[PDB]
Design a protein around this nucleic acid. Sequence first.
DNA 1: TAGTACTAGGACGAAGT
DNA 2: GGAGTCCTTCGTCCTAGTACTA
Lengths: 366, 366, 229, 927, 56
Amino acid sequence: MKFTVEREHLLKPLQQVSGPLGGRPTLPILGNLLLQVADGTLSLTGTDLEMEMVARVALVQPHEPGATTVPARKFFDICRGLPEGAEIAVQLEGERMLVRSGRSRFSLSTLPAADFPNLDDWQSEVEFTLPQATMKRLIEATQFSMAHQDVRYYLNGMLFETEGEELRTVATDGHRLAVCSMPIGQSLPSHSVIVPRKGVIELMRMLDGGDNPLRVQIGSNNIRAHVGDFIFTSKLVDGRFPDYRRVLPKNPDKHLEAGCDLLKQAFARAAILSNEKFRGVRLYVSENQLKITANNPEQEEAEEILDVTYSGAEMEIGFNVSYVLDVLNALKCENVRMMLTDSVSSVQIEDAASQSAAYVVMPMRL
Amino acid sequence: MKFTVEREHLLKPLQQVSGPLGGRPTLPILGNLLLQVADGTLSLTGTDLEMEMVARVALVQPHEPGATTVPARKFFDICRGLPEGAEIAVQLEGERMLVRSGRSRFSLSTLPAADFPNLDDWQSEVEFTLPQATMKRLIEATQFSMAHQDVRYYLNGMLFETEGEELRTVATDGHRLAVCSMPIGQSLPSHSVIVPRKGVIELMRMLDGGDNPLRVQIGSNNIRAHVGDFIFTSKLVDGRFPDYRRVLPKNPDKHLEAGCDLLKQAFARAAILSNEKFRGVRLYVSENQLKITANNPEQEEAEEILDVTYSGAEMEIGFNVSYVLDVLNALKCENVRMMLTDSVSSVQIEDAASQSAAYVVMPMRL
Amino acid sequence: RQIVLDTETTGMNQIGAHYEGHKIIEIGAVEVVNRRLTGNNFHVYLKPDRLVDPEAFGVHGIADEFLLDKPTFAEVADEFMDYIRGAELVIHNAAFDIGFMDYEFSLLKRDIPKTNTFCKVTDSLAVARKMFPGKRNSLDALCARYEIDNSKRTLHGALLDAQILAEVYLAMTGGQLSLPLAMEGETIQRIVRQASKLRVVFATDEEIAAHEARLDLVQKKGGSCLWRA
Amino acid sequence: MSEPRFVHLRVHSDYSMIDGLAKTAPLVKKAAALGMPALAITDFTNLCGLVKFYGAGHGAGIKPIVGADFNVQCDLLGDELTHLTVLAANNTGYQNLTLLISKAYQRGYGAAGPIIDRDWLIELNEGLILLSGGRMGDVGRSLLRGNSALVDECVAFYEEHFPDRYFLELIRTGRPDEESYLHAAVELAEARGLPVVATNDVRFIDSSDFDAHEIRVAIHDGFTLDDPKRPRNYSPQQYMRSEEEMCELFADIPEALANTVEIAKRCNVTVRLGEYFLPQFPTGDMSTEDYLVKRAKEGLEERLAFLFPDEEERLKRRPEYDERLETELQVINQMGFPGYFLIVMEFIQWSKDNGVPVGPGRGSGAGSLVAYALKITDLDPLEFDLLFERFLNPERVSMPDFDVDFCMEKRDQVIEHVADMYGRDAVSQIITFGTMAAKAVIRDVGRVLGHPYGFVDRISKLIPPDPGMTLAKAFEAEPQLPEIYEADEEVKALIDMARKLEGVTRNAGKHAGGVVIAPTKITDFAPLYCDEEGKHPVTQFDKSDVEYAGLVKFDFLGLRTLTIINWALEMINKRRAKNGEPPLDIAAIPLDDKKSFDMLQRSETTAVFQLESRGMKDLIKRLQPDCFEDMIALVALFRPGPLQSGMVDNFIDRKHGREEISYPDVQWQHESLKPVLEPTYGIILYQEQVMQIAQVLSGYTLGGADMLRRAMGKKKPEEMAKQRSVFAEGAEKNGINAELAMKIFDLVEKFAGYGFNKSHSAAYALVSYQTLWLKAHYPAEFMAAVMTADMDNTEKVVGLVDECWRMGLKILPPDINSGLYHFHVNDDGEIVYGIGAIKGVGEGPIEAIIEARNKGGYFRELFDLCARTDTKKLNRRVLEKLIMSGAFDRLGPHRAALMNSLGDALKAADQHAKAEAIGQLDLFGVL
Amino acid sequence: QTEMDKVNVDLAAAGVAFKERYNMPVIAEAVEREQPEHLRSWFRERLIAHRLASVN
DNA sequence: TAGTACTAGGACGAAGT
DNA sequence: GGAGTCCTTCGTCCTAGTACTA
């Protein structure tokens, strides 16, 4: 085998495949790249045993097909270091890959392609497309609610639920919940499935700044996403998860709105004097007004008072402000609305412009 | 106790006086910020047990003295968090500090001023002016050479020597070093101050890049520095910085030129395939050329072929890529000229436009 | 030119003379010139004159019969001595080798002297101990410290360690040299020899009496007092 | 007088434990061999070998001169670490010295050692003489810096508060800055008019001990010979240079030498040793004497009612007890020990009222009926004629050894009660310096010198386990030592040096081995050392030394066995309410139980104390002891003497009518010795029998009896010969034949060398009987207790189960739900493991487990367990053992499936516990 | 140089020799697998010339 | 706005054949 | 003056607590 590639085509893929690689992944082969020339293209790959990234790229200059396994992290970092428009000279001969670029010269650790865990081929079940920019909304509107480590494995990842023509997603840890949905414009079967944390990181990663169509195909127990020439593969898990319609509070009777930015800045401020581990505060609400106060073990005490649209009596309740500030960052609006039940049940929230991401977060017992 | 100040007037002082903060300060009130109204000005104080940062801000409304010390990062963020032109009104009622902003209210944990040590006022020896800009390059150009943790504690810091009509600074690891010399326009008596790394960190941060001129006073074992509105004060480490002229190389007879960006690029690239800790790269110089390689533990090999102007004798020499990249990252200039003596001496390294500075690593023989 | 070895043999005596009843079998002959790896080995082997020690076997697993017909120490004593003559001998486990080297030179019975008379004897562990006092200064220890592969190389010792130990040696001497500061290294043996008015503060008549009474107690309770002798 | 004008004034023994060398006596023998009349020992921040110092000074006609070095903090240098060397002139200084030391230790410290505040020189002021601190003082550091204002501030203080009681320390030993310091100090000496005095800062006998001392320090420090970072603060010239050597060394500085004469005059400290300093408060409202007599009669009343519940027999047997009572009373009162007993007896009563079963030793205290009457001892000495005049002899007005120890189980409780009683500072515990084994000293030398782990350990693991093993002994016991000596040059250098190191004190006593009391602050008489927090104070004198200083001792014996008993008793008396079996008091057991003797005859006596030896179990089997006296004998039997004189087989034969009973010998016998020798079937066994028969046969005093027995321990020719004459005419006085008497006296002499202390044997044999009763009477129930005792030892654990198995005693594998701290038996459920029976695990985790099990019921699964208890207490390592063991088996069914959900369970605990702690609810529900 | 790989197989096949003094551990079945094809021929004869001679 | 590097502390084994 | 008594060392691997940079 031999190949030649154009830095700028291949640099972005390199960054795509390069990001997920853990400081130390489990099995050394996972530290190297899949380099296969099949037909007229190279496919580059890194895996964590649960996810996989592929980029397919046109080779304009002479080549012959083949297979190898070469060091990923350092390779990408080298390619960051390359000059604009770089012409690269690389070649398989037996158990060495020779890497030259321009007049620079390199000699590599090289393993066979077959020593790398070649991930699984499977049959498509459902296929569909969407804009990249809508997906980023869906993701970024929901991503932070996943736990870092929940052993209820069905928490660590993002739920995709397909029924009728709508695809609906959600993330949560028991303490926050966020949902985001847009319709796909095609009548689908039913497939619902949740993606692993690290899988979803990479999916985010591949949402480059383009309006180019993003396509994903789901199998029975695995999923693939094509966005043009940027390619994604991950297996899925059985993933029994709860029905989110049992998690939704049905109709919390009292309603509340308030201005997002004012809200957010005030939260920002008041939040700092809640204990950082508990994020503890009490919210007292009255007609046309909200009063915010806290204190922590350090015996710092807080108060913020502001303009809120609210009709009804007082209420007493407290939250993790990180959780809400994260929604407020995502929340791209002037007005948001809370629709409340009580201190021992959910609080539902909805963006006065979103109508797609509603939020229910648990408070404290004071 | 009274005063009134605007958000915009508090913001930058607060960030700057918030510099010394961190490291789980052992004497708890060191983790707090001192509010003092004294004479015609509001003074804030933060210490890290070795240094102090003072801010002077205009008190235009009526005020009265009285002072206390409130928890620092949290407190800085509150003030930073308020909107443009905000009503900030604080008042000491003995033991408690009550802080308000308009209709919002803030009541803090409060430790009295007298738990915070106030460090001794000291006597000046030498006093001077120059642009901040000059001082920014000066510190930045040597910062990286100071060790983070060395047992030779005196190297965790920077030698300031003023001499003749030149301001002359220098720092080191015990491995590598940069020294720099700038003309100041007036007579300076001979002086030495050795400032701990924390100190120079703080000094770096107080360069906000203004054209506000920089004026500084230095005592025997203390220091004073004025940037625009702000005034810095610290004590230093007592002694044992050796004579830097001792380590200076002895008339390097070999000259070496290569384009700075190019040069920098090749180094960056090459760094990635060396020993993780030791960054081992190999240099063979010859008429019109240099041979660059590194070998790393994973049997990997890089080599860069390059644009080298060279007149002098042929020799072999290798040294730690990280340390030299640090100088190359500081030298955003036209050319580097390197001046060599032999394969077993310290080497001199230069911007080909400024001999104001000198950079140096000794080699390892690998 | 600087030449080293750690040598694998017909096992060891664990007590006293670790060398007694043993002779050398293996030659990987390191040539390292200006701290660069030539790999210029003379590769033929020697006579065991005995069967394998059980300890030695478990460390490396070698067995006698491969190394028996290959010529003895006497046939390449001079060939190999010329290979090592006029050199720096920085070596690990010095007590073992030097013991053997010098000893084998005399055992030829051509009166060929001990190696320390024509070669510079240096222990590598002494220098390792100097650099890393109270750390493990072993081959595998420092191997892992300087990140060299002895995980894909099962042999302990010499047909591998030659190469490796060179890299180790280089690391230790090629660790990084130091910035000539002005420093004064303690262990300078001097005495003042002076005279000038100073005050002597004497004990009182009563203090003397307390002492004389104390010595009474020494003498009378003890049966003698050497002040009162 | 004829020659001496000099002594060395800064000198340290090895007992400092950061510095010094060898022993103090050899140092003193050299000072004497140098023709010195006096000498100052200034051990580092202690005078621990002052006992031995006095002993040596007194003995050799040398005046002991008192001093020490310290860790100084003046606020002018901050916490820059310096010395002060501080010497006492007289009684006043001695007290102040002792207090200063104690105050430094009371304050607490780290690796830098105890530090004193300079301003403690306020209190500790009068009667003291002080130094510059030498080269590295507060004065020395300030002089080396050359800041004259800083210097003036420091000196001024000492010139003010210590006028004519401040001399300057000088050292020229070829070390850095000795010239510079000395030169600047002689300028200060002119300038301030303060007196100068010369020392050699001595730490050793011979200049070749340098290496050893260097290593001594490095042993503490933990660094290697060739390490540049390692402190090398000392030179080899610091030895006892002679009179004339020192005269010419300082023939440039005359006043320095003359100030040794001056200082020697000033230093005369009186501490009385070898006779008692009164440690007793009056305990009740009475005279000291009378309170004793009273509580003796009242203690007697308990024992009487217990021993003789038939009132007819009480009266018949009574006279002997009243007579013994009064006999002992008279001697205790006349010798002046009743204060001691009052404390102890109140203490013993108090420990019974609290849950403190009685510590195992009594020494030979069973010789005292008084001790017994006051409940100081456990079983009846007049039933078996047990003898006081071993325990205190009137014609030996010396050591009254009361020979008491106490139980570890309740240690802090006791220490605490006696601090509540006397005052925490009136009282202290004692150094138990961990004994420097041949192992240790070799080990440590070797690593410091940079021999490999393997090299040096190959040498030390050959050395037998003996505590008194020396290099002299090592060479003769093991032929491999001469071998490696001749076969390694660096081992020769090692052993020449290691001969000087052999048996030096290793470092601070980790924790005590006893306690003492004074009438006032203990520090008025003895100094302290204290633990890493400056707490749990220990006396600077060890066992031998502290009591030779005249102060009161009580030794350690932590017999896990009393804890067994305690625990077994509690658990047996729980079986009270379970089946109406009354509260059982170990003192109140019947002494004739045949179940007990049946099981004994079956040789099932493992973990019965001192019947742990294999040979001893063989001996039980052969001996077939069928009365209590045979059982007392067993410890005296299983020894080198009795086995190598055929004594075992003699007694065995003589016991069962295989050989005739004689009083004592086949040829040389007398029936008037039958009362003495009845229980041993004519076999001459005890120290008690010795003295009985001297008194009974030949009209001796009981104190004359003790004198003979002591003389036969020493085996002196003179001692025998005199008493051998009075022994002959004493027999003749009572009509008993001369030749018979003297030929039995030869047999006495033979067996006197082996002659065992009955009272000491019996006190410990008591305990074996107790372990036996509990075993046999309810041995299965005790078995729990047996296993409790040996938790940490795997070997014994396994042995013990095999012992249960043989007994028929169905041992069950564990259950976490039913398990207690340690072993339990349900009524039906014969046996259950203790929870402590889990292999590695520490105490905090196990309390956690059970605490959770208390609040909840039995934990339903894995899950329910983890939830109830916080993660602090649940480590994965803990839980890994739990899976491995199968502690869960009953609840968590699978072997493998449970290991898998272990991570899950941990995580659930973090997730569910931690959220509840934070205070935030989740929304899952429905499992 | 290439007989220097081949004659190191004479060295590895000597492992099986010390079976004939099993006073401390020597594993006969391990060498079947560790030794690849280019040396099986030399290795198999090496076993037998070794095993009888490590006895004497 | 998220992820890893360093230190702490106990547990287990030791320079080379 | 005779006799009986105490604990252990250091470095590296694995996981959790609190900091820093892209």
